[PDB]
């Protein structure tokens, strides 16, 4: 893994871009690891990165969502991708289209024969100022379910500490979509979207942390 | 809204320079500023129409310049001050007119998010300063 | 560099007319088409944004259409404060240019 953790190279952290569908069946993090990109915690990230370690790869399949009335493809100078601002790669932030932010309702069928992984997040702001800059509403909300689970998460405004010059947050959150289900992601501000899914894969692969050298 | 008003503007000797200045006050949506947005310079000669002359977007890049002035004039700005600035060079006696300096209506950053709109939209000027006139004369 | 045609130069119409002022563009600009009135001595004031919206404040007697090469902003009723000249202008690629203007005067 060099500089980069798994769940970096999960999401796309650029400097971790290197990492862009690669598998492996013993990952390695290093002590020296480091996030260069928009702060985030991941609830549970210890889960996620168990599974995704477990599921031995980051091949990522890129869908054709669409999102109607809101502009794509928000960065940040805290993530820069070359000399500009950046974004993790898969995901998406969105943000309002002139001066409205509406119900974003899509959805996902799963239609092949293996399960999906999807990530995505929830952005919370440091201010209200922020909060209706960004998403026009006061207050947001997203809601990603399959046919038979949902997670709600509102988002929270508040400074945090100051990182990479920013005290607001992204929280990431993942969702199963097995063969035959669907996805519907329900968004009225806040959301930071996928851009597609991780291929589910079982077999012998794990992760392990050292700092030992890699030998012939 | 934000509101703009343009200074720095005079009579001028062909060949010489001179530096205007754009001060941004109030605010629009989300109390945003006119750091978070993209704004250009336009100026309108004697009885004549607009001539867009520069754009900055509200980070300070994707810079670009009218060929009448392009290599002579230079646009930057100091977000922290919320002023925008053209300084042009080596004027000549057609570089006469009132300049406006013209905001663009789409956000293009906020800097408590760390978001930045990944392209320059560069929409309607939805908010105009009353102008700053420039004479280059002998 | 896009041109931007506006007809007629000068146009002359009674308190109360509807009125039409064209724009013209040398080549396909979609709907990216803003339309401003500038009255004398004062900076131009935008009217409609993205061909056909009215922006938030101005008067809804103002109305905007079209698209491709042709355009149009309607004002359905005319006030006489309406006087003064207007301007198209195009945002499809750089350079930005503007219509060399349309002067309305009221007959009265």
């Known amino acids: 893994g060099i500089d980069c953790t798994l769940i970096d190279a999960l999401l796309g952290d650029p400097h971790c871009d290197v990492f862009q569908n690669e598998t492996w069946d013993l990952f390695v993090e290093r002590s020296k690891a480091f996030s260069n990109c928009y702060p985030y915690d991941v609830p549970d990230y210890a889960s996620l990165r168990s599974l995704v370690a477990s599921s031995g790869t980051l091949e990522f399949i890129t869908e054709g969502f669409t999102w109607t009335g809101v502009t794509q493809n928000g960065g940040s100078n805290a993530c820069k991708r070359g000399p500009g601002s950046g974004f993790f790669s898969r995901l998406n932030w969105l943000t309002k289209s002139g001066s409205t932010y509406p119900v974003l309702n899509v959805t996902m069928p799963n239609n092949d024969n293996f399960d999906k992984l999807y990530i995505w997040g929830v952005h919370h702001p440091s201010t209200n100022q922020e909060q209706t800059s960004l998403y026009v509403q006061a207050s947001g909300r997203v809601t990603v379910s399959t046919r038979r689970s949902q997670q709600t998460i509102i988002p929270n405004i508040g400074s945090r500490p100051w990182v990479r010059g920013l005290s607001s947050r992204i929280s990431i959150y993942w969702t199963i979509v097995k063969p035959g289900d669907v996805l519907v992601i329900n968004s009225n501000g806040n959301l930071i979207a996928p851009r597609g899914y991780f291929k589910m894969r079982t077999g012998k692969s794990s992760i392990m942390r050292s700092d030992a050298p890699i030998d012939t | 809204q934000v509101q703009l008003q343009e200074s720095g503007g005079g009579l001028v000797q062909p060949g010489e320079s001179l530096r205007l200045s754009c001060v941004g006050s109030?605010?629009?949506?989300?109390?945003?500023?006119?750091?978070?947005?993209?704004v250009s310079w336009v100026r309108q000669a004697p009885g004549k129409g607009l001539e867009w002359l520069s754009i900055?977007?509200?980070?300070?890049?994707?810079?670009d310049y009218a060929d009448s002035v392009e290599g002579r004039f230079t646009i930057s700005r100091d977000n922290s001050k919320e002023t925008l600035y053209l300084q042009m060079t080596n004027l000549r006696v057609e570089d006469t007119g009132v300049y406006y300096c013209?905001?663009?209506?789409?956000?293009?950053?906020?800097?408590?998010?760390?978001?930045?709109?990944?392209?320059?939209?560069?929409?309607?000027?939805?908010?105009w300063g009353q102008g700053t006139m420039v004479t280059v004369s002998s | 560099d896009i041109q931007l045609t506006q007809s007629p130069s000068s146009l002359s119409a009674s308190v109360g007319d509807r009125v039409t002022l064209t724009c013209q563009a040398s080549?396909?600009?979609?709907?990216?088409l803003n339309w401003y009135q500038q009255k004398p001595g004062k900076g131009p004031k935008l009217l409609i944004y993205?061909?056909?919206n009215l922006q938030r404040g101005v008067p809804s007697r103002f109305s905007g259409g079209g698209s491709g090469t042709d355009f149009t902003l309607i004002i359905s009723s005319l006030q006489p404060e309406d006087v003064g000249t207007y301007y198209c202008?195009?945002?499809?690629?750089?350079?930005?240019?503007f219509g060399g203007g349309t002067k309305v005067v009221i007959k009265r």
């Open positions: 013209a905001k663009h209506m789409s956000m293009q950053q906020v800097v408590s998010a760390g978001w930045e709109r990944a392209d320059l939209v560069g929409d309607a000027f939805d908010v």
């Open positions: 109030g605010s629009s949506f989300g109390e945003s500023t006119l750091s978070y947005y993209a």
């Open positions: 900055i977007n509200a980070g300070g890049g994707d810079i």
């Open positions: 080549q396909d600009i979609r709907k990216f």
């Open positions: 993205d061909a056909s």
């Open positions: 202008q195009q945002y499809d690629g750089l350079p930005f240019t």
